[PDB]
Structure formats: C-alpha cells, structure tokens
Design a protein around this ligand. Structure first.
Ligand SMILES: CCNC(=O)N1CCc2c(sc(NC(=O)Cc3cccs3)c2C(=O)OC2CCCC2)C1
Ligand SMILES: [Zn+2]
Ligand SMILES: [Zn+2]
Length: 327
C-alpha cells in the first residue's frame, strides 16, 4: 500500500494516454522523477517488459540513471521535457489512423528515442558549442553536436551496473532497434526540420490506406520517416498543449535562451537571435515560430492522420490567437 503522495501521483498518471497530462505536477509529486515514472507507466501500459523480457529493476535502474544525466539546472532541456516528449510520442503512437501499423520493436524505438533524445543537454545550442570551440563540437565535427551526444550518452548508460534493459533482445532486434533510435534522434536536430517536413508533405500527397482507414507504410524509408516526424512533432508539441502548459514551457525555453544570451555577452559573442533578455518580444517570437514552423508541421501531420489531430490543431490555433492578443 502506497504512501498518500504516491497515491496522488498515481491518480495523475491515469491521464497518461491523454494530451495535456500535467507533467509538471507529476514531476513535483514524483520527487523530480517525471521521466522514470512516466516511462515505467508507459512500458507496463504497453506490456513492453513482457514482450522484450526486461527485468523491472533493470528498467528502473536504467531509467533513474538516464534521468540523473539530465541537468536539473537547465530550465527547459531537462528530464521534465524528456518525460513530456515520451508521453506525447506515446499519445501520437495510439492515434486511430496508425493503429496496427508499427511493430512492438518500432514502438519501443520511438519511445526509447524520446526518452534519451536530450540527455545531458548543457542548456546551450549547437552553434554556441561550435563557436566556443568546445570539446563536444570537435568530437562531432560541428555536425548535429548535441544530438550525436544525446545518442552516445543514452546508449553508453546501458553499460552501467544493472542498466542493460535490452539484455534479452536478439542481435537482430538490437541492431534494428539501435538504427531506428539513431535515425529518430538525429532527426530532432532542428536544422533537419524543412527536409523532414518536405518528406512528410510528399507522403501526405502519396498517402495510401488499407482495410479500415489505417495508413500503409511498406518500406523502411516510409516507416522510419513517419516515426521521425512523430517524435519531432512531440518535440514541438508545447504550443499544442493547454495554454497553462504551453505558457510554462515558453517561460522555461526563454529562461534557457536568455541564460545563453547572458553567457554569450559575458564574452562578447554576438547575442543570438531572440536570445537577448533586454530586447525580445516573447509573444511575437512565439507567433512567428508557430506560423513558420509549428503550424506548417502540425497541419501536415494532421493531414496524415486526418481527422485524428483535429483537436490538437484547434488548440494550436487557439493558443496562436492568444499570444497574438498579448502583443
Ligand atoms: C528557425 C528554426 N529553429 C530556431 O529558430 N530555434 C530557435 C528558436 C526555437 C528553437 S526550438 C524552439 N521551441 C521548442 O523546441 C519547443 C517550444 C515551442 C514553443 C514553445 S516551447 C524555439 C522557440 O520556441 O523559440 C522562440 C521562438 C523564436 C525565438 C524564441 C530552435
Ligand atoms: Zn534536442
Ligand atoms: Zn527536445
């Protein structure tokens, strides 16, 4: 029998299958363990432990280890953000239009990639790491610096004591899982955005459907690019969440950006675009960002899974008009 706090946490976790879970409340209730508890809930919810023979304590140990490698003093790019994207991907996976499409392995990869996609994020951008001549930048030859590091770290952690949650997968399963996870995480790099969206639009144009309205994806290219856009959507899903959640996310990312702005000035690096704490229209940046990136993307997704994303798209448009007022 759980403590009262655990019971309250548990009643919150009953919303796991719903857009708008109050992830910040879960983070509070769980003693800053939103990623661990949300992942554990999803894995049990999707029967992943049985299917892949994952020992539960190995799962817990890894999860806790993973979460510990997110930075608590990073305003946005932290374990709470990881948890959010995990659960969001989780919801997108359950969309009616994609029912019975993806194998258990592919689901496992989409969720695991979500969990690790930002681990050990230092709270500054690729360009900042490149311009400071940082070790990380030189390791990854300035290309997808953070994203390569997230992957390397997330896999490496499997080697810590009692952390290998994939210890029972066959070599075939592990090689396939790993490639999918790598393709998914590298695609979270925003510099890949336009091309990702190009492929997504192209697939909407050529969209096919079989037996009860469910999408058809008959080659790795198509299947992986869908999962890639799905996680990228989860990663840019803040403006589609209830305004209460969206506003908290905006505060956090702007706090992070201004911190980077401060660090840039403390050294006379050119103050990044809209990273200047003194001259910034948060409201205006959010609208432009929605019009130019978030809405085109979500609208395209909505077409792929029509009409499943209708409410998410409505919410995004509502939050867009709201921020517009604010100006
Ligand atoms: C142009 C391609 N990408 C980029 O420019 N950059 C800089 C601007 C930006 C990103 S990623 C992101 N937002 C998120 O990933 C999730 C959220 C969306 C909405 C609230 S949290 C923003 C962003 O929300 O930044 C603000 C809007 C403009 C400046 C501040 C990369
Ligand atoms: Zn990222
Ligand atoms: Zn992210």
């Amino acid at each position: 029998v759980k403590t009262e706090q655990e019971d309250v946490l548990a009643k919150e976790l009953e919303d796991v299958n719903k857009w708008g879970l109050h992830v910040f409340r879960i983070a509070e209730l769980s003693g800053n363990r939103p990623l661990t508890v949300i992942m554990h809930t999803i894995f049990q919810e999707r029967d992943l432990l049985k299917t892949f023979k994952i020992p539960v304590d190995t799962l817990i140990t890894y999860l806790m280890t993973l979460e510990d490698h997110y930075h608590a003093d990073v305003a946005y790019h932290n374990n709470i953000h990881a948890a959010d994207v995990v659960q969001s991907t989780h919801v997108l996976l359950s969309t009616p239009a994609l029912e019975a499409v993806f194998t258990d392995l592919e689901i496992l990869a989409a969720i695991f990639a979500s969990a690790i996609h930002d681990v050990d994020h230092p709270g500054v951008s690729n360009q900042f790491l490149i311009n400071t001549n940082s070790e990380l930048a030189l390791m990854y030859n300035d290309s997808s610096v953070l994203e390569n590091h997230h992957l390397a770290v997330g896999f490496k952690l499997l080697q810590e004591e009692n952390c290998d949650i994939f210890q029972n997968l066959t070599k075939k399963q592990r090689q396939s899982l790993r490639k999918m996870v790598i393709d998914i995480v590298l695609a979270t790099d925003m510099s890949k955005h336009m091309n990702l969206l190009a492929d997504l639009k192209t697939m909407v144009e050529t969209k096919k459907v079989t037996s009860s309205g469910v999408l058809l994806l008959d080659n790795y290219s198509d299947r992986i690019q869908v999962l890639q856009n799905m996680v990228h959507c989860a990663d840019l899903s803040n403006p589609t969440k209830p305004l209460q959640l969206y506003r908290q996310w905006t505060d956090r990312i702007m706090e992070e950006f201004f911190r980077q702005g401060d660090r840039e000035r403390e050294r006379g690096m050119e103050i990044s675009p809209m990273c200047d704490k003194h001259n910034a229209s948060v409201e205006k940046s959010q609208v432009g960002f929605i019009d130019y990136i978030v809405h085109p993307l979500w609208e395209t997704w909505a077409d792929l899974v029509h009409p499943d994303a209708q409410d998410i798209l409505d919410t995004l448009e509502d939050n867009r008009e709201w921020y517009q007022s604010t100006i």
